[PDB]
């Protein structure tokens, strides 16, 4: 149901790390990274046009063309879990996106 496996989120240090890349990619300086900032970012990591969807819907949640801040953090947490071995989410964990890191 609701439930699935629970995930070590994203730390204060994870959304800096993420962050500075995060202003790497944002060419148009306006908060966002387009999809085409996105795909080429995580086609530098040899990521499957599979992962490269999958992790683009676990992470634009406001179902909009541009990936945000918030959501460009997540998409490199779910990246380097990928790499890491770890599955990607059917859904996106609640206490991952809810985490005071990302509200702060
Ligand atoms: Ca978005």
Redesign the pocket.
Known sequence: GNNQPPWPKMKPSDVQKYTKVFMEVDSDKDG?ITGEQARNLFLSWRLPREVLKHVWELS?????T???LR?FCISLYLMERYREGRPLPTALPSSIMFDETLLS
């Open positions: 966002k634009d949640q406001d179902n909009d541009m990936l945000s959501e």
